[PDB]
Write a protein that binds this ligand. Structure first.
Ligand SMILES: [Mn+2]
Ligand SMILES: [Mn+2]
Ligand SMILES: [Mn+2]
Ligand SMILES: [Mn+2]
Ligand SMILES: [Mn+2]
Ligand SMILES: [Mn+2]
Ligand SMILES: [Mn+2]
Ligand SMILES: [Mn+2]
Lengths: 393, 393, 393, 393
């Protein structure tokens, strides 16, 4: 272990501050003072803290109340040294957002949600956050006829392009990151996966400052490969932030500690974030943010334990993934399997489509039957990663 | 019923020609002669037939054999009147494609798969097909370390941009459509959903002639809303073709008759294809193609029955969805729920982001508590669609 | 279609009284007065009402308070004529229950939970209820090492046999119904499916008065077929009560209106409740109970609408399901497919194993390839079911 | 870690002999000679081999042929010393079996399938096998009206009790093990989970010699916890055999190498096979059998590698799992969390229901808010398990 601030472990206020109310029960923990949250996080080794507006400032707060709270909050940041790398807005708890924020059927709620966002953009800039996250949790429906699907996407576009144009207009040094979720709280949430998220950004006017904030558990709620999806975000140069946690299967969003869900996928998620790609290419250099929830069965000693464990898990995993790629038998296993070979272009420098068709040895005279003999040896290579992860090698 | 050629029911050769070998057993039906397939489809009311290259022409076929087969095939098209609207290539059965076609770790297989594609592009143009589909079924992995994820996407890009540039170079009146699948035959298939498919097309050089071919069962294998996904393809103006079928849940690709899977989703899938969007916008005007498989428990009388049923189901559904939107109580229910209200822009013509923030009634003086009272009445509206579908109204 | 008391439609107080509180937001509706719930449902068509101890009597209610509430509810019931066929205990909302009631790791908690069940049996008996339902929703774990799983079942058993022993001793005309759920609120719940519930019941000292309370959506959360699951419960004669609602996939417990999820599965569930088994066999006679939640987007008009919609859906399905088996064409299809042949014992009267292996026509000289030619025509029987469901027939 | 015959590792002939044929492609490897399978596994560390009647003896084999094959296999076995602990029947590949064997709608097919099972019992007994496994993979439907579900179970029962009756009559030292699977090849399979298998067994005339053969991947296909499922089988004393492999999610039956799926679930399965229950209870003693498939991308070096990898994974996990319970710190955590408190009966010796409801300290005066303060510290016990699994401890 021993996470140190250069590791860039940032934690949201709502993670450790999560009191335990689930769908079937009330909170099992007393509320957590934000100032207390800041001092405890800094003591554990974190680099920063993130928050939703209503996490710090009540929806009812008066102007006088908002400044009291921000003073104490800012003093704490000051006393401890934590940064505030990401800020986000609550567009899901208050009953007003029951049909969404940006894509609410009610036009007056669309405006109210957008004005909440713009003001929150001002606070984000004021705190020094470089990313503004957007989790559209109530954008969706339970029933397919509830919405005009085309208009729901035009209304989502309007909100995001209005917010973006405002960032550019003010010259805040902020980027927007969308956070996909397939379901919960809605039956079907719009932009349910990384692909949808990614595709949507490409139809925006201000797409240049809009990227994604994928969350392990969310892609895993659709049965998808999380590494595969973050790989694709990075390859598109849209992986602006990340939420790390654990999910055991397709069920409700569990938000477990990172590594307490699909352990082998967490191993390869850490290999991509730390090591990047076998043949070279992009790297993710932002914060390693944890969006989890301390199990409701545990008191406050598990709250700080769970926070410690996230960081532990990531450095345990980082350690084995460094050892793994550095190991000469793994590097040779990779060469046998064709990992480096995929890096070579298919076409020879200069060869046209007409050329290759017409190249007798690639088609006409190709021995297909002989190329099929090849042992890719992907099982042996999988076995080498598991043994490294198991601490055996 | 009574499907007529203007309905645009096109069927693949491999649907009705599917003999029954699954993972746990051999074929239960005798092979189906393609000429026989053409005459039977035309008799039933179809408009066209589609095929994979190896569906018609064996992988081993000599040049002399290829022309014999094409003569008889073309005479049949001629005798009956069917069009050939889409053509696709087999890059998954032969053992050579065990690690993929375009994204195979072996460079010699990448070339062989790409040269198979280019030649098949020539046949597609020769047959009069307007769409060339690409289902990347072996592109993926069972293990996360098997591939360099960034290089897998560069190699997928190369194949698609090489094929596209060839279409533009020859001036074929062809468009490429990608077909997403989350898994099977691979543990994880690249571009697993519509979003991923959509996002990927945006990184291509020749993205203008590349669109999607979503399949009901495939999105449903990730737990997604199929209408939601095709809505998004259409909104992006990338819904170039469609595969309709049935899937009961997250399991292996079942390929049931359209309507024998999630019936309520098929109702709204047909409402979007036929009716489009409540407030106006894009429409899909291509073929209604069926990518299904006759259950292996049934003989050839079920083969033609299953083919009849697909078309029946779609016209039964079309009928109720027309009645549904035309019904004045449904239109008023829609108005109560805010379906038309979502169509209005959030911002007043001319209002800037600064203006609305600063507009006291949208934020500062907004009564959130009062806007939350609103009864959206989405349950009543769902009940009106189910009763219309049930033939009750 | 109009519900009458003879339909045996029952509703829980928690269903129409569901305030809207979910994991990402607060109540969207005011609390429902029990008196008013009773009256309202009485005019809707309801047969009876069901409740949880704490739905009616607050956890901390004083004796005076308890008495008042009880006199008010009992008044209501007398006035409207509503029966109280099932009563259940809330062993999941209070923080004390965070690790379970019956299978909590803490022994004082387990005794409290059992005390709370015993007292509730008394109330259930004073109310005239025939069923006592146990939904062990906090019984399970998030983590695999948190429980001694053999010991979790012994503790489950101990509690259930203690509750059963007490019924028998007291002369109460009550049976216990266990209710499975695979996950949520815990990551994994003990006795997750109908299969697991039936199995556990056979290990009980008093399993004669312990049966199942299967819920539509719960079986669909592990992707199982509801209809197959209650068919095994019925066959074993352990289908004591039933919970009808809708679920649209493997995700959080949606609790939609019955028929508002998987429509074809709903139709076939109705077919099984109403027509029983094609070759005869046991038949379900209890209440048709709905455990659903009016979506939180709808106000109180929506609550009664949705309640109305449950009985409406069931009746519509029933009408279609009786039209389907009454249909001669459907009966022809049934004979062809071997539906009635299934009910014919495989052996002949007094034929042993030895006699069968020795019968030459049965094995040694059986023409397997010729038997494999049968066209089951299952596709066509399913098209006929769907056509009856759509009311196109 | 090196396997020895004392480890009881068993492998099926169909596993390492799996040729590569899947639903979208052909065999990628040549057929395996049985003789060679035997020899190879013998040098790997295997305890024994298992097979299906038709893995060894072709369906259409003449008597001369059958005898030859049997003499060759029996030779092999003698030469290498390999035991044959389980034998099973293939009632799924031939077209005759398309609607089931035991629960086919056609009555002559059901008699053939039962004849084929009886004859196979004989062979199983001549081979010295202790277990006779029934995997009813064609027993089920795609469509809900295709079967009389009460009648499907009676037919299942009839076949299983007939097979059991014959064992008893013959004096054979054999027990039957049923093997659940939720879907695939059929859309829905009868007796889909461990729960459903245990339930069915209690309705049998001869259930004393009928138990379960749970497969890791099969329970994970309905998203259930393997470890909880074999824990109920063990508790009921019905865990007769086990099939270990890996599955990475709710999708087609992957049949990966044991530990190559859900790693933490594998570790806890190993912990349960090796350490049994924390408070004591029954213990599994049979073979540790692997029913997996060498990925089709790998050639024959890959087949033996993957076989090797199964025993390798199990041993590595075992080493870690014995280190974990041996650890004092882990034992401390266990006591704190209430793992040993769970094993303590809830009632006191000879305390009745009445005595409990009447005990004031247990209910009336229990301090529920004070009991709710306990910090179970389940997160920390799970971090300790993971840290032992990673070998960082
Ligand atoms: Mn989450
Ligand atoms: Mn998140
Ligand atoms: Mn498909
Ligand atoms: Mn398709
Ligand atoms: Mn429920
Ligand atoms: Mn229920
Ligand atoms: Mn399997
Ligand atoms: Mn198996």
């Amino acid at each position: 272990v021993q996470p140190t601030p250069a590791d860039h472990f940032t934690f949201g206020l709502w993670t450790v501050g999560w009191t335990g109310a689930d769908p079937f029960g009330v909170a099992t923990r007393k509320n957590l003072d934000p100032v207390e949250a800041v001092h405890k996080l800094a003591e554990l080794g974190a680099y920063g803290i993130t928050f939703h507006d209503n996490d710090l400032i009540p929806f009812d707060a008066t102007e006088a109340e908002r400044e009291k709270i921000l003073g104490d909050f800012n003093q704490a940041l000051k006393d401890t040294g934590l940064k505030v790398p990401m800020v986000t807005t609550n567009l899901f708890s208050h009953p007003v957002f029951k049909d969404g924020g940006f894509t609410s059927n009610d036009r007056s709620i669309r405006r109210f949600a957008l004005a909440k966002v713009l003001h929150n953009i001002d606070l984000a800039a004021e705190m020094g956050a470089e990313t503004f996250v957007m989790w559209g949790g109530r954008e969706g429906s339970e029933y397919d006829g509830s919405k005009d699907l085309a208009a729901a996407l035009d209304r989502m576009r309007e909100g995001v392009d209005t917010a973006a144009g405002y960032i550019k207009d003010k010259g805040y040094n902020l980027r927007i990151a969308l956070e996909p979720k397939p379901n919960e709280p809605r039956g079907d949430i719009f932009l349910p996966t990384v692909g949808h998220g990614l595709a949507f950004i490409e139809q925006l006017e201000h797409g240049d400052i809009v990227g994604l904030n994928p969350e392990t558990g969310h892609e895993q709620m659709a049965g998808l490969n999380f590494t595969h999806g973050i790989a694709q975000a990075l390859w598109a140069e849209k992986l602006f932030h990340i939420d790390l946690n654990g999910q055991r299967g397709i069920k409700y969003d569990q938000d477990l500690v990172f590594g307490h869900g699909d352990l082998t996928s967490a191993f390869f998620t850490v290999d991509l974030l730390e090591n990047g790609f076998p043949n070279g290419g992009p790297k993710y250099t932002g914060p390693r943010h944890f969006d989890y929830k301390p199990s409701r069965t545990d008191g406050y000693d598990g709250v700080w334990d769970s926070a410690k464990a996230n960081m532990s898990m990531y450095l345990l995993l980082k350690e084995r993934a460094l050892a793994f790629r550095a190991d000469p038998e793994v590097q040779e296993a990779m060469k046998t399997s064709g990992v480096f070979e995929l890096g070579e272009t298919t076409l020879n420098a200069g060869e046209s489509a007409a050329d290759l068709m017409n190249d007798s040895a690639s088609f006409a005279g190709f021995d297909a039957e002989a190329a099929a003999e090849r042992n890719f040896a992907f099982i042996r290579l999988n076995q080498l990663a598991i043994e490294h992860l198991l601490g055996s090698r």
